[PDB]
Design a binder for this molecule. Structure first.
Ligand SMILES: [Cl-]
Lengths: 164, 223
């Protein structure tokens, strides 16, 4: 596929080497964070926290030895440094959210995500089988929180700001 | 190129740089005066290709050529299965003159031998995470199909071979895609993919297995 994912400065998004903020295009006041779903333990669900910005930055990782991300690549998305796989995103069936984005500490060679052009920025798309059709990542509201979750047709649209 | 060194200037005169607004994102290999071979995942609708380089400042590299290209042909089985058949041919807008610093290389017809010591070159990231100033080179050993398949199944396909994975942590890294793996004076592979992050102990890189595509290559270039 043609099209290269770019950051808010028009530069290609790097393959794993640099970290980026996912900035909601109409919720710039809100940042990505971790929250619980109800089962105490540690917080492992990804939310948009309206009161704390700019949020936890991400890296986009392909096993391809190219230094940029194209919209057609399957990716891992993760919190933290390159060297660690403690904050790797996966989508987990979980009451009462639905298919929630959650952090895990294991990673497939091909992650399940693509980043695809939508409106004024990008959406995250989940491809559980790594086939032709994927499901948009949107917001689901419960327990006073906004959880990242599969919401096909209702994506959350982000711009990608280099953590620089 | 992880844990290699500066190449001897212009010792790899088939090396091609693929650049986007004067930043490199992939390499390729001059295989014919009007054709560069690269990884299919590096596909772009048009290219700026640097030949004869050592540093990536063409302005500072006498004998270098920056040439335009718009036609590229991805192998028709690319990504079936996923990551497999990872080669494409770029036709340069005009033929290039061969010189002391710009030269075609022949492609191996024989498949790789486990234990064979081969050379990878590129301008990708270093062990320290920075980009190098000049073309890097490193020697890696071809790994058995048994060790390749155990590590990468179910994504191993015989359009791929593995190399590197030693204690020395020698490996390709991001930006080395599409560049050459040379064995015994022939082009044997293209940098393709591996585990991320690169350089892990015991995890070899994967390279396009060019001996399986010598007929598709000859036919595309001749059609
Ligand atoms: Cl901005």
């Amino acid at each position: 596929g043609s099209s290269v994912v770019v950051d808010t400065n028009g530069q290609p998004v790097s393959n794993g080497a640099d970290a980026y903020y996912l900035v909601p295009v109409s919720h710039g006041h809100a940042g990505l964070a971790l929250a619980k779903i109800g089962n105490e333990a540690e917080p492992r669900a990804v939310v948009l926290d309206p009161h704390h910005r700019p949020g936890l930055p991400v890296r986009f990782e392909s096993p391809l030895r190219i230094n940029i991300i194209k919209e057609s690549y399957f990716l891992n998305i993760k919190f933290g440094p390159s060297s660690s796989d403690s904050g790797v995103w996966d989508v987990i069936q979980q009451d009462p959210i639905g298919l929630a984005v959650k952090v895990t500490d294991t990673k497939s060679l091909l992650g399940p995500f693509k980043v695809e052009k939508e409106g004024e920025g990008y959406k995250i798309v989940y491809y559980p089988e790594r086939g032709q059709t994927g499901l948009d990542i949107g917001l689901v509201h419960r327990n006073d929180k906004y959880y990242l979750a599969v919401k096909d047709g209702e994506p959350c649209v982000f711009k990608i700001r280099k953590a620089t | 190129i992880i844990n290699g060194e500066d190449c001897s200037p212009h010792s790899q005169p088939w090396q091609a740089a693929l650049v986007m607004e004067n930043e490199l994102f992939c390499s390729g290999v001059l295989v014919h005066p009007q054709w560069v071979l690269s990884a299919a995942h590096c596909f772009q609708n048009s290219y700026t290709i640097g030949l004869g380089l050592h540093s990536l400042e063409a302005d500072q590299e006498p004998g270098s050529q920056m040439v335009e290209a718009s036609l590229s042909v991805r192998h028709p089985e690319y990504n079936r299965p996923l990551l497999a058949n990872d080669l494409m041919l770029i036709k340069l807008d005009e033929s290039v003159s061969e010189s002391d610093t710009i030269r075609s290389i022949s492609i191996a017809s024989q498949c790789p031998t486990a234990g064979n010591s081969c050379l990878v070159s590129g301008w990708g990231l270093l062990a320290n995470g920075r980009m190098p100033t000049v073309l890097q080179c490193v020697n890696v050993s071809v790994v058995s199909e048994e060790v390749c398949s155990k590590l990468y199944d179910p994504l191993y396909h015989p359009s791929m071979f593995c190399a590197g994975g030693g204690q020395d942590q020698k490996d390709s890294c991001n930006g080395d895609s599409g560049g050459p793996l040379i064995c015994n004076g022939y082009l044997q592979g293209l940098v393709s993919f591996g585990k991320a992050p690169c350089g892990q102990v015991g995890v070899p890189g994967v390279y396009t297995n060019l001996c399986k595509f010598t007929e598709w290559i000859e036919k595309t270039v001749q059609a």
